[PDB]
Amino acid sequence: FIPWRRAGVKYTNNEAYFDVVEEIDAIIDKSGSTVFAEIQGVIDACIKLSGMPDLSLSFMNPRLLDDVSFHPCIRFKRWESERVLSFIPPDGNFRLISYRVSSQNLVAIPVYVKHNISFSSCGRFDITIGPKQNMGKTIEGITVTVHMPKVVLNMNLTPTQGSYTFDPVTKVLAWDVGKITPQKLPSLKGLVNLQSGPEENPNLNIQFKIQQLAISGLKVNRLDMYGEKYKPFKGVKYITKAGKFQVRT
């Protein structure tokens, strides 16, 4: 009577991995204040364990987890009573839980954008991106997409790194930034051509990924295995990525 797991699978090396993956949605106003932010997360598992192991995963700060959806292998009663995720896992890859992070704390905002944008047949577009509450972890995979208003015809910008395109039919500017390095912040600056004859500056939509960080602060305490007596490798990795992250200008 464990429906999600057959007996007698044998691996040559017994390993269990968990990946805590958080997506940050935020709207930041033109002064740098958070208008809105929320964090959603998943814990994904990759379980390559022989036999019938029974696992208990616990956290340092389980009060962060709100609105949790559980994989059916989880014994809900032991979460409710001890805040331990106790389960005999399916084999292979599966999503253990999904959650929303509690409102009790503000959301950490791991990047900032300095902007000087003014929109005559000629405007100025200057932005620089940098690390903010990122715990010094590398910010990579950064892209910045901007839906320019109809008045913008074309642009001549200089990226300090990466590359950009501007589509004069869809009016989208897309800057493939790459990663932030310490010595030299990425910036994109130059002039914009306007159709001579503009209320708010355009929003900046940012994608990014940050290894070795769960922006909620979620941290695993222990992973204990019962019912088998071998000593498996057990590890956890954390990553934060942008969901819908927007800076207004």
Binding site: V220, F233, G235, V236
Partner: peptide
């Protein structure tokens, strides 16, 4: 890459 438990 993974933190060992």
């Amino acid at each position: 890459d993974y933190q060992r438990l």
